């Protein structure tokens, strides 16, 4: 019944491509993220589409092994997670670099002006790099300061550890090391569930788009907050969604282990 396996692989590829393209469109075209992408280039879309693909793959990863072909699909899903995590990490490295360069006076004037938001009590920041520290020390400080940065570093390290310790040789001839170090998936999922708790990547609020009109106020950056047509924009980030995708498989695997 190789037809079923081929159909499953093709459906998986189609779903991954569809999710990537759809979320790229979501985070690239709409004017809600107009200022966000004005600050982050296309790195915004390139970091938030692999996020959706990673939610999908992290939902899929644990199902094959929950006994109560399949291991091949598990390996393919793990490698897809690795690929999408690589794209996500590279895009967010670009985001961190540009954000830190903008916070200090080392970027284009419009990006710097956008970065000034949030310094007052009644302002919501767009540039999540708040401390005015130069590079590369600024990016390193963000990595260990932001909850997203810390959790991302931890889960990425455990991901490389799992991948490198799940190689064929270690898995056939040193199954003890493989099995003992494979339980880093616990840390992986614990970090991934709280990864987006802070909501640092922010798009313009839903209501702020009504009072603040993008095409009327794009080039009035300096006058925001002191002319009627251009109230200072308010930004807000999405709530954490990956826990919704990951909780199901975690519960199923926990039930399976309890059965074992």
């Amino acid at each position, epitope marked *: 019944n190789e037809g079923l396996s081929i159909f499953v692989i093709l459906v998986w590829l189609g779903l991954n491509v569809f999710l990537f393209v759809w979320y790229y469109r979501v985070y690239d075209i709409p004017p809600k993220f107009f200022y966000t992408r004005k600050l982050l280039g296309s790195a915004l879309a390139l970091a938030r589409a692999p996020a959706a693909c990673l939610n999908f793959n992290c939902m899929l990863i644990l199902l094959p092994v929950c006994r109560n072909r399949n291991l091949t699909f598990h390996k393919m899903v793990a490698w897809m997670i690795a690929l999408h995590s690589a794209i996500h990490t590279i895009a967010h490295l670009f985001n961190v670099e540009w954000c830190v360069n903008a916070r200090v006076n080392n970027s284009d004037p419009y990006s710097v002006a956008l970065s000034e938001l949030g310094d007052r009590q009644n302002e919501s920041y767009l540039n999540f790099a708040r401390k005015r520290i130069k590079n590369p020390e600024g990016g390193l400080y963000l990595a260990v300061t932001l909850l997203a940065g810390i959790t991302g570093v931890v889960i990425t390290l455990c991901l490389i550890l799992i991948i490198t310790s799940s190689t064929k040789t270690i898995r056939r001839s040193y199954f003890e090391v493989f099995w003992y170090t494979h339980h880093l998936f616990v840390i992986f999922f614990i970090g991934l569930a709280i990864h987006g708790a802070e909501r640092i990547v922010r798009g313009q609020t839903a209501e702020s788009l009504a009072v603040h009109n993008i*095409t*009327v106020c*794009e*080039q*009035k*950056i*300096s*006058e*925001w*907050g*002191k*002319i*009627k*047509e251009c109230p200072i924009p308010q930004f807000a980030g999405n709530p954490p969604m990956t826990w919704k995708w990951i909780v199901g498989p975690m519960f199923l695997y926990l039930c399976e282990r309890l059965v074992r």
Partner: antibody
Amino acid sequence: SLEESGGDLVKPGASLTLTCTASGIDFSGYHYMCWVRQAPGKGLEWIGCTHSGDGTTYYARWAKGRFTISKTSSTTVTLQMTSLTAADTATYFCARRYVFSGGYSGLDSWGPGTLVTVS
Amino acid sequence: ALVMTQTPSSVSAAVRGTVTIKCQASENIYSNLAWYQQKPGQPPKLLIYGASKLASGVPSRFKGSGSGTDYTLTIRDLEAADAATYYCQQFYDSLNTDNAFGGGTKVEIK
């Protein structure tokens, strides 16, 4: 500096265009370019403004329907008046609303002004 | 609509005296105000561009102040060359406003 061309005796109900040509200033930054008129012996009356970059144009409520301000070139801005009446006789100033660093605006540069007579 | 009213339509003060010109907004303009001095037969000269921020070349004699709807202009050591007319312009609201300039105040030297 700025200077307003045009401005001549005009029969009521006709149309006239005042051209504001700069010398040393380019209308391509983020500052506006407003038109202000002052009837003989009266206070200043604001007509409208034209952002240099966006192109958005604002007019006073009385001038919205019959005054057109357009940035024809990088140094010349034109105000077109239609359905002129005797009440539109006044000295028309061309002023640059310089958006200073803090974000607060002020009509930094003013033109000498051109008399317009409607009768 | 937003209308500015300059209550002291005509104020007189002797040389080295002080003159207070009040320009109150009908609506809360967020300190975006400008004070111009227009000598007869001359384009107005900007004095204050912020609510109280002096313009280039304008001495500290011309003080702006106030916040919200009430703003003031003051002249510490009024000279003989200050016999001009002073206007206040609000840049906050330009959508629906009959006139940005707040009427006009004529300053006389005693």
